[PDB]
Amino acid sequence: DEDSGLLEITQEKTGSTSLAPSQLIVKYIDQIDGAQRQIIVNNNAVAAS
Amino acid sequence: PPLGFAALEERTWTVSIGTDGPPVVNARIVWRLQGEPNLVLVITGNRIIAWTFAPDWGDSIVERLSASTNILQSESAVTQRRAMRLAPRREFDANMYAVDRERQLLDMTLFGWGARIWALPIWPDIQLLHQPLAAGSLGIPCDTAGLDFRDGGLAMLRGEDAFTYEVVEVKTVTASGLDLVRPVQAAWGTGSRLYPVRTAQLTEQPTLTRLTDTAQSARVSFLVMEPSAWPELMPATTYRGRPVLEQRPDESEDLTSSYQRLLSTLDNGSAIPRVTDVAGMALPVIGHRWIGMGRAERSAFRSLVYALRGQQKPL
Amino acid sequence: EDLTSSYQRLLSTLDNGSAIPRVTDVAGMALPVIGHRWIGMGRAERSAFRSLVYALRGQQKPLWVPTHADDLTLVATVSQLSTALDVRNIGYARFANGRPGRRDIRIELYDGTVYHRRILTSTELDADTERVAIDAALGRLVEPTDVARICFMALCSAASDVVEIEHVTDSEGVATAALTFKGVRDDEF
Amino acid sequence: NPGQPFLIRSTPRGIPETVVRVGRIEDNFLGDGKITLTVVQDQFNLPAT
Amino acid sequence: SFNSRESSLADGQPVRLYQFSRGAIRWSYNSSDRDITYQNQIFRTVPGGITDNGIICSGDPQSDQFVITAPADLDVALLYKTRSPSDAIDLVVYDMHYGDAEAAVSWVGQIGDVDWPTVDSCRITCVSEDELMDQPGLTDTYCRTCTAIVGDHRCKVNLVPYRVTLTPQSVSAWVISSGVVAGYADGWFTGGYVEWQVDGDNYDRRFIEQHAGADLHILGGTEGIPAGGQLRVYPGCDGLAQTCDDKFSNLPNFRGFNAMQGKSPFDGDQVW
Ligand SMILES: [Fe+3]
């Protein structure tokens, strides 16, 4: 804290939300056969916006 | 060197150590004889030249005590202190003159010795002997109350002229005299000056101004390269476990006060500025002046300054 | 206007930390700095000074700059063939024992004749007197009563290139200027 | 040390008690006495399902 | 009290201690103006002071260096003036406050580089163990030679029986000559190294370009070799299987592949 050992905080970096992805593709290798495989991860909330 | 030693004979040579030579004494004298491993007598030490010029006392001599303490404060008015140098560096500023036989000696010394360690006597600590000092006597009975005398230090007797002087090593302080290890080889009667000696170096070579054919006034400034031990004592009064400054400041020069604040982030654009109180607290600033008119008060002030350690210790 | 002198040194690398500093002599040599002023009161002197300034070309061209002090005073007459000048002990041997700077002499007799000599080595003789040596001869027998000053010589060059010639009345009139000279190691060494 | 999470509070800035993870470290023990840290909000977690 | 003093707002008396260690020899220095005794070790005071620039831990070895500034006459740094010591000088940094007997370890590492920008100062760049991870890690090749330095943990060859202790006959700028080695076949010592005691339990090592008769060729010159000091010389392995077994009889540990295959694939064009 300011009185507990903090001097000054300068950077804030509020960031943004409208940007950033809505769908993510992950590619992995299955060691049983060594064939390329992929899975899909979706962000419905961000996708709608 | 080749000379036989008689049986049951002890030959004691006289090792005379001069005053002229390289600054660092790095000597290795080898006593080599047949059928015996080399027995090298190693002599080590340093060569220094003492400052033997009396500066006139028309203008006050300024003594400066400086220390380093980098302090960083947060948004709130809270400070953490990090006193760096335990022994403050001491600087001396004074003016001097040289007319008869001292101008040429000063010029030669400055040209030759230049930027090298000196043995600066403490001019403010001048002292006059009360009784004559016999040649070869061990111990100088003199006042040592509130003086810059330390065990294993140096002392420098002086006469009317620059030449009349001699430096001795003080072992300890008995509160009435100066224990000495080496006898004094010349007797000076009442009137000869006694000066504490501390190592010093020329911070900047003085700019000599010619007054006449043989006359030059110099503004010599010296800095001591040895810690200056001194007792640290605070004022007797105590309040909430802290010292209290009971001294009344001198009013000879008018003094004012101010309320310093961390009032940054004024944020001035083009239309109108707006100042925000980061902490909303005021830390007053006060000035102080005092007059010694005595050895005891000056010693107490020096102890207070040493105890302060810059901005570290509050009161 | 009162003038002073200083011993400028390359005394950098003080290396100050927190506990204690320590200064090291990179060269262990002192180069003196001397100031100079003059009055013209004539066209010829002003022309000569302008020629000197042009010849200097700033700090480039050096030239000896004798002092005007009285550092050394004789205490015993010296024969013409003798090279054992005796002077009052001013710690010269311990400080000055032969090295660039403060090793030149101008006798400057009463009549006006001046002899330029070159110190070779100084030896301590007594707590009050010394026997500083010279290079070759003196010219004649001179008693201590027939010496004005010694005024150690030293090679020096200008310290500031800019020179201000303050014209007051006219070309045929008074003028004032100030010059500063600093020692420099030159003359083939 | 790097990766160590800790809390920071600064009422004037309007930042409540927040959990952040240490990033780049640059400290100056002697001289300036400045200890400056770069931190990020704690949002790292590996779900088991 | 160290932590308490750090949290203290009025007792801050920082003092940084450096400890340079090389085996049985230790060098102790402090940044204050007086010597400090800690753990029965006294730290010398350097005229002019010793100071650093700060500690950075950003995860990048190239950027997280530690810089030390000290005079040019520093004893530990003086060794690097002529030739870098064979062994690395480990450095440990402590932090303590004057009047307290407790100290905290801050930085640990070894000397990375040393230079003397000015006669009155010297700059030392200290690197951490993390920087040793930038070099490759393949360390494997299917070649004919052994691919192993004689005496390494892979060769498993004991060089102590082959140690030869001798006093050199004559030392030149690039060649050190001794008659004892003249009794060995040419090239016997090729690839070996010479080690001799410098101080305490630390030795300096030098490789050998070639051995011929009574003359030994030293890579990089013979500077720093004592003319009368005792020298230990070890042989060298060429790496060939015949060389490995005839001389050292270490064929079972031979890591090379002499005649297993040079190119032969099983998916080529024509076997004949
Ligand atoms: Fe092998």
Short mmCIF file of N, CA and C in Angstrom, two decimals, chain B residues 129 131-137 157-159 164-166 183-190 192:
data_model
loop_
_atom_site.label_atom_id
_atom_site.label_comp_id
_atom_site.label_asym_id
_atom_site.label_seq_id
_atom_site.Cartn_x
_atom_site.Cartn_y
_atom_site.Cartn_z
N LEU B 129 50.72 26.66 24.23
CA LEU B 129 51.28 25.90 25.34
C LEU B 129 51.35 26.76 26.60
N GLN B 131 53.25 25.69 29.44
CA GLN B 131 54.58 25.49 29.99
C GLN B 131 55.52 25.03 28.90
N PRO B 132 56.82 25.30 29.03
CA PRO B 132 57.76 24.88 27.99
C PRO B 132 57.84 23.37 27.88
N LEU B 133 58.10 22.90 26.66
CA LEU B 133 58.24 21.48 26.38
C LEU B 133 59.72 21.15 26.25
N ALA B 134 60.22 20.30 27.15
CA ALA B 134 61.62 19.91 27.12
C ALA B 134 61.90 19.01 25.93
N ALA B 135 63.07 19.19 25.32
CA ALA B 135 63.46 18.35 24.20
C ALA B 135 63.57 16.90 24.63
N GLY B 136 62.99 16.00 23.83
CA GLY B 136 63.01 14.59 24.13
C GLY B 136 61.94 14.12 25.08
N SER B 137 61.11 15.03 25.60
CA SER B 137 60.06 14.64 26.53
C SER B 137 58.98 13.84 25.81
N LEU B 157 53.21 20.80 16.13
CA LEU B 157 53.65 22.04 16.75
C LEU B 157 54.13 23.01 15.68
N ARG B 158 53.98 24.30 15.96
CA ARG B 158 54.35 25.34 15.01
C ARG B 158 55.01 26.49 15.75
N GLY B 159 55.79 27.27 15.00
CA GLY B 159 56.41 28.47 15.52
C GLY B 159 55.96 29.71 14.79
N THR B 164 59.51 26.49 11.39
CA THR B 164 59.49 26.01 12.77
C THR B 164 58.24 25.16 12.98
N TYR B 165 58.41 23.84 12.91
CA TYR B 165 57.30 22.91 13.09
C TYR B 165 57.86 21.51 13.22
N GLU B 166 57.03 20.60 13.71
CA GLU B 166 57.39 19.20 13.84
C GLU B 166 56.13 18.40 14.14
N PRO B 183 59.88 10.53 21.09
CA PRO B 183 60.23 11.78 21.79
C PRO B 183 60.39 12.93 20.82
N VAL B 184 60.08 14.13 21.30
CA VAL B 184 60.24 15.34 20.51
C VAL B 184 61.72 15.71 20.48
N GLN B 185 62.23 16.01 19.29
CA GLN B 185 63.66 16.25 19.09
C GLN B 185 64.04 17.72 19.17
N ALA B 186 63.10 18.61 19.48
CA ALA B 186 63.42 20.03 19.61
C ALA B 186 62.41 20.67 20.55
N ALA B 187 62.91 21.56 21.41
CA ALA B 187 62.10 22.16 22.46
C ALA B 187 61.58 23.52 22.01
N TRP B 188 60.27 23.72 22.15
CA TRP B 188 59.63 25.00 21.90
C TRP B 188 59.01 25.50 23.20
N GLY B 189 59.27 26.76 23.53
CA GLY B 189 58.76 27.35 24.75
C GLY B 189 57.33 27.83 24.60
N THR B 190 56.85 28.50 25.64
CA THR B 190 55.50 29.03 25.63
C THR B 190 55.32 29.99 24.45
N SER B 192 54.42 28.74 21.25
CA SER B 192 54.33 27.90 20.07
C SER B 192 52.92 27.31 19.96
#
